[PDB]
A paper describes a structure:
Most insects, including human-targeting mosquitoes, detect odors through odorant-activated ion channel complexes consisting of a divergent odorant-binding subunit (OR) and a conserved co-receptor subunit (Orco). As a basis for understanding how odorants activate these heteromeric receptors, we report here cryo-EM structures of two different heteromeric odorant receptor complexes containing ORs from disease-vector mosquitos Aedes aegypti or [name]. We determined the structure of a heteromeric complex formed by ORs from these species in complex with a [name] fig wasp Orco that is amenable to structural determination. We find that these complexes form asymmetric tetramers containing 1 OR and 3 Orco subunits, where activation of the sole OR subunit upon ligand binding suffices to open the ion conduction pathway.
To determine if the 1:3 subunit stoichiometry can be observed with other members of the OR family, we turned to studying the [name] receptor of An. gambiae, a main vector of malaria, that responds to the natural odorants acetophenone (a plant volatile) and 2,4,5-trimethylthiazole (henceforth TMT; an animal odor, originally isolated from anal secretions of mammals). The cryo-EM dataset of the unbound structure also contains an active state, suggesting that, like the AaOR10/Orco complex, the AgOR28/Orco complex exists in an equilibrium between states in the absence of odorant. Overall, subunit stoichiometry, mechanism of pore opening and ligand binding of the AgOR28/Orco complex largely resembles the observations of the AaOR10/Orco complex, suggesting that these might be conserved features of this family of proteins.
Author numbering:
A (entry chain A), C (entry chain C), D (entry chain B): 4 to 159, 168 to 243, 313 to 473
B (entry chain D): 3 to 397
The structure:
């Protein structure tokens, strides 16, 4: 919890540890033992509820609509389990990534901009974490309220059904007795924990991306005065200064590239699994939306599911796209200085940088796609087209 | 002088800017708040009543869609009002920079630049006049048709006319209108809102097109300067003079790129909302036409709603395409000079110039995509595919 | 005739003029007045037949299948009329294009290579024309053939229909000897002239593209001895010789670029209109193919329509794709030479040529799209997808 | 069997010859005669069996389900026939490709890296060959077992049908007598031979791609020390050494480019035909999967067909994608050296190499597409969408 890129992200690491995202790496060994059991317990509880959910879906397969709703719930709550199991297996690469920026470069002339942009990155990371936490809390409260404003009823004739936030089969009578209140408490805990683990892993990915983008911003900001330093014939000392500045710029850019590659390594398969689950979720959600008539509870539930799913996709796409834009705009930043007035070394450096910048940095979901607003647009178009085809038929 | 003269007039007629005819327009908060107050007028007079009628009084899907199309267009125009009010500062700074560039160019001693200047001024004036006049005519006719009907009926049949006047649009208000005073005041506010919306549409579309025209003129001036550098290369002038001339050319290129950047920054969200709404409206109207195909009165309304949408899309697509095309052609212009006659250093500078000039530079729609004519082609292809698939799947 | 690019394409020009494609530019003035009259008559005749077909469409609109057949025939025969009218209005740009290569560059060292490749180009052009001519003739014959092997009958009860090669309404009897013979002769003339005019304009476009591609091939081939001439410190005479070689290379490349630009300006709107017609043609043809059930005549007619349409599109796309491939291969071949042994001027020339060649030459349908095998693939995929949807429904 | 790129692929060549892939080139001429007859015999048997399958299709066309299954089998077994015929007609380009790496370049400083990466390439080829052979054997065993676990019955009433591994019509009674065992043995041999020939040709293609990728890896690994060799001004000996190293690097890169072009020429049409057959196979398989209900034999057969087809496509796509990725990453490797400290020739070499690497090497299916994971994703999405539409209808 000391070296760079772990001190900056320490609040997010603490959230993830608190919810149960393992990570037995960033505290004193004294807490190493107890926390572990807590994690296991949480996992077990999750699985328990998940299993008790799946069992319900087995006897809810007589009809199609209830089957569709149960399947959507199961996929939505499969996301967090997949993420929670995914992290520990790849903890090696995750810890390699979190220790990438422990020993960065330094130059006297660019220390001030470096510090300014580091602080800006930290502030942006904290803001993102708080915003996502607020969204998660709002979603939990909305679920816990909608489960009460509506009416619990089963259509066959009318048959009362236990009023619970998540449909589930329980060995006990979870209708009116203390089993009812126990079930509500357990389901509330399940909702909070699942949403927390999923969104916290997503936020860690996005925070890595934000740090990379801010480092690119600093690189451009110092690109502006680097040429002025070169422009000025020149004495040996000035030539050495230009060489050192160019070395600093190139090495910092290479460091940013290393960080981006490590982030991709760490999270590509997670992105692929997320999108695979999403696809089916969105298909079922389009079928469900085909049945909406009015502004009743059903519409609220369908819109909530669609909004949460597309919001996760949209966060990923936003930050991938921002990385792409900064990496590309490096060239514009390099062109707008007085490169024609510099020395031969500076002009060649600008040339090579401009050649390099033609390809934008990006994160690929296991080489099957890249995260960007184009991906979000394609997903949205596909779901809209499928919904139109459904409604026409 | 005063680039975008007719655009300044039309903006002033909207109270968007109170001192448009100044060489360096100023952004004053008085205009901001006055324009916000004006923006709230069409919302209350047109948007809300029409939306209420759509939600409540509609009885069938056909009526729903027919009432939904015009309401969507009005909502888009109001959104344009709000977006441009928000981007006031950037838009005004862009206009000021364009004026500065034009003033710098107008001091030229070369007849080619003067001809370019005159052609650009004539083009902008003519385009603004035609577009604004046509849209004002359309909106005034649509709004005031029943007023003219009443006047004609009163003049011809005197007091025996069996004609009762109604408001220009199908809408429902919160209060009654049977009273003459309320009816008259609501009618006046409806006309005020329609006038504001028409001026908004015309003025902002004309501003986008005219800024594109001026950027194109600047690119042509850059082409002329590049050709002059080529002639100086052929004539064989010393290295330092060629360095200076290339430096000036690069500075002009940077200025034009800055202008494109400002235009994109000012109009990205405008274009995104425009394209989204237009495409969705095209799909909806195609569906409606399919449901009411054949010879009948209903087909007429959809046939009228379409062309406005297609032409409005085509305008933006064409001018964004021009921006991209000129920005690209800079590379050809710089390749065609006798650079092989220059010593390697100037050739390397030209190489960096060419590397920069080749990057696709244009106007994006909220960064989702770069707007060009292929965007219109894609929208048309999707519309046709949707139409055919709808016909087949119908039965 | 005695100038380049019109001497090479002279057979195409003569064929075009022979079939009535206006172009009163490339013969002695004595033939100017007779030829013109002929052209007018041909157009007249064409239009007349076209009109006589459209009238039939009016009385064959109550049914839906014959409406589709008539519409397909009408669009097929619309192509030639549009091309015929299109050429004269834009004749100025066509003549500007045909006069591009009247005064080309020349260098002693690269003359032989030039000549060879020039010769090569002509050969290919000839082949193309012949091939297309053959195809055209085949189509005509096949058409006529089918019209006599099938049975001319209309379903209402069975009503004998006049046995003509194109469904048309005629004031004549069109069944007895005189009317039947006249209709057969007139329709044969119509088919020949329409196919010939359309394909002749298409072949002119493709021949322009072939010439451009062969010029690019010449540049790539000669780029090697240019560098070897640079490589060897050099004496002044060698510097001047290398400069002359570089100047020749660059000027010839710019000339090729100008030719490609002129070709695009000449033919963009023609391509746009062609594909606009072809889209509706292929939609109706997919619906027609939905009804095939093994019958020889109907299946053969549908397959012929589809083959001809896709063949026109394929010809345009393949030649555009060849242009793109040659343009990029220019960079590829600029790389693969002994530049590392050269001088500063030669290496800078290589760098600038490669940078320029980063963007490939192409022909666009008035900037609404690009002609390449990708466009043909898109058209084919769209038609196949629509057909599959139609058959499933 | 002595020169490079054939000593490396020798197990592949021997397996191809043994299965009957003609290729009478890489053994003593004394064996050329016998082997030849063997090849012909295999083909005959294949076609013979193949024919008897097609015959069975003709009399099974009463129903649509059996027709669909027969067509799927017919295409699946069309694949190997097409590959077997395809190789001999294009054998000249194959032999040209296999002899492409007979005389590569050599530099004293980069010999160890070249040897290491050559050995790594050989090991990877061997691993790929063994894995593909294992998959083929597993598929054969699965077919031979599933034919026995299931019940041989035909539906009208219940009609017993011969228990054979492939539906086929035989002049004799292949139900109970020695005909049954003869048919079993013949069909086992047929399956083994067909799968072996197809997969062996594909594995040769993939081995070419792996060799190219490993050569690119060697190029990057040696690019790292090349700049440091240049950086240090330089005495004439040093400049000669840097020139020699740059010459080596550029020539080796050009050699890899030549190899990639040769592979593309050899196998583009094969890729096009493979994907053409796949498309229809996958369409029919989606229709078949629409009828699955349970975990019975039918589901197993359908899932196996889909798995095999998508596995072939996935193999092609993964290796094409690897080629693209290595070719692109050459640019990153060129940027990441210490060029800012190098000399002018080294810096110009870096600039030109980056320019070249701006575009990535790839293999195209006759210019109609590129083999990459994007193609696999598009195929998978198309089949999934078609299945969804089918179930909706």
């Amino acid at each position: 919890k000391h070296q760079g890129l772990v001190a900056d992200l320490l609040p997010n690491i603490r959230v993830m540890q608190g919810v149960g995202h393992f990570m037995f790496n960033y505290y004193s060994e004294g807490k190493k033992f107890p926390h572990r059991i807590y994690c296991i317990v949480t996992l077990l509880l999750l699985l328990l509820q998940y299993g008790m959910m799946a069992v319900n879906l087995m006897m809810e397969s007589d009809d199609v609509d209830d089957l569709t709703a149960n399947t959507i719930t199961m996929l939505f709550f499969l996301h967090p389990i997949v993420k929670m199991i995914y992290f520990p297996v790849r903890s090696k690469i995750f810890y390699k990534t979190l220790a990438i920026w422990n020993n960065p470069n330094s130059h006297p002339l660019f220390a001030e901009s470096n510090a300014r942009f580091h602080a800006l990155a930290i502030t942006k990371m904290r803001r993102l974490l708080f915003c996502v936490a607020g969204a998660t809390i709002f979603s939990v409260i909305s679920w816990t309220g909608i489960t009460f404003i509506e009416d619990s009823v089963k259509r066959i004739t009318i048959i009362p059904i236990p009023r619970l936030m998540i449909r589930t089969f329980y060995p006990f009578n979870a209708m009116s007795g203390a089993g009812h209140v126990f079930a509500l408490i357990y389901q509330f805990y399940y909702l909070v924990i699942s949403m927390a683990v999923s969104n916290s892993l997503d936020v860690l990915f996005c925070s890595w991306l934000l740090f990379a983008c801010e480092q690119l911003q600093h690189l451009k900001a110092i690109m502006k005065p680097l040429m002025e330093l070169s422009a000025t014939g020149l004495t040996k000392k000035q030539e050495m200064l230009v060489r050192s500045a160019i070395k600093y710029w190139v090495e910092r850019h290479k460091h940013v590239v290393r960080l981006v590659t490590a982030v991709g390594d760490a999270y590509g398969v997670a992105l692929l699994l997320h999108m695979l689950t999403t696809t089916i979720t969105l298909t079922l959600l389009a079928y469900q939306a085909t049945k909406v008539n009015g502004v009743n509870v059903y519409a609220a539930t369908v819109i909530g599911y669609l909004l949460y799913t597309l919001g996760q996709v949209f966060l990923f796409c936003i930050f991938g796209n921002r990385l792409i834009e900064e990496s590309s705009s490096v060239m514009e930043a390099a062109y707008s200085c007085h490169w024609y007035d510099g020395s031969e070394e500076a002009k060649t450096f600008v040339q090579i940088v401009c050649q390099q910048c033609q390809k934008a940095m990006s994160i690929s979901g296991a080489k099957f796609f890249t995260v960007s607003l184009d991906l979000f647009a394609s997903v949205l178009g596909a779901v809209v087209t499928y919904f139109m085809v459904l409604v026409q038929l | 002088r005063l680039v975008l003269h007719e655009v300044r007039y039309v903006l002033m007629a909207m109270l968007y800017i109170s001192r448009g005819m100044a060489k360096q327009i100023q952004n004053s908060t008085i205009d901001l708040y006055v324009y916000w107050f004006l923006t709230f007028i069409p919302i209350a007079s047109l948007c809300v009543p029409q939306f209420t009628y759509l939600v409540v009084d509609t009885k069938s899907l056909i009526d729903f869609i027919s009432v939904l199309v015009p309401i969507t267009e009005i909502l888009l125009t109001n959104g344009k009002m709000i977006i441009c009010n928000v981007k006031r500062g950037k838009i005004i700074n862009l206009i000021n920079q364009v004026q500065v560039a034009w003033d710098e160019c107008a001091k030229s001693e070369h007849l080619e630049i003067q001809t370019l200047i005159t052609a650009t001024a004539k083009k902008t004036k003519i385009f603004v006049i035609i577009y604004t006049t046509s849209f004002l005519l359309i909106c005034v006719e649509y709004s005031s048709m029943p007023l003219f009907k009443l006047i004609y009926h009163s003049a011809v049949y005197g007091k025996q006319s069996n004609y009762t006047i109604a408001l220009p649009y199908l809408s429902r208000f919160a209060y009654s209108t049977e009273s003459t005073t309320s009816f008259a005041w609501t009618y006046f506010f409806i006309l005020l809102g329609v006038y504001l919306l028409a001026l908004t549409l015309s003025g902002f579309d004309s501003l986008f097109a005219t800024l594109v025209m001026h950027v194109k003129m600047m690119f042509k001036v850059l082409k002329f300067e590049i050709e002059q550098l080529g002639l100086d290369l052929s004539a064989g002038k010393s290295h330092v003079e060629l360095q200076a001339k290339l430096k000036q050319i690069i500075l002009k290129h940077k200025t034009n790129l800055s202008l494109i950047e400002q235009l994109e920054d000012g109009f990205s969200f405008f274009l995104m909302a425009q394209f989204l709404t237009s495409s969705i409206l095209v799909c909806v109207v195609l569906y409606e036409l399919t449901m009411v195909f054949g010879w009948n009165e209903d087909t007429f309304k959809t046939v009228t709603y379409l062309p406005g949408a297609i032409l409005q899309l085509f305008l933006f697509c064409w001018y964004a395409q021009q921006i991209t095309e000129e920005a690209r052609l800079v590379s050809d212009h710089i390749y065609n000079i006798p650079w092989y006659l220059a010593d390697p250093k100037l050739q390397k500078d030209i190489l960096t110039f060419m590397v920069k000039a080749q990057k696709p530079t244009g106007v994006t729609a909220s960064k989702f995509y770069m707007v060009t004519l292929q965007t219109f082609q894609r929208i048309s292809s999707t519309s046709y595919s949707y139409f055919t698939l709808l016909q087949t799947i119908n039965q």
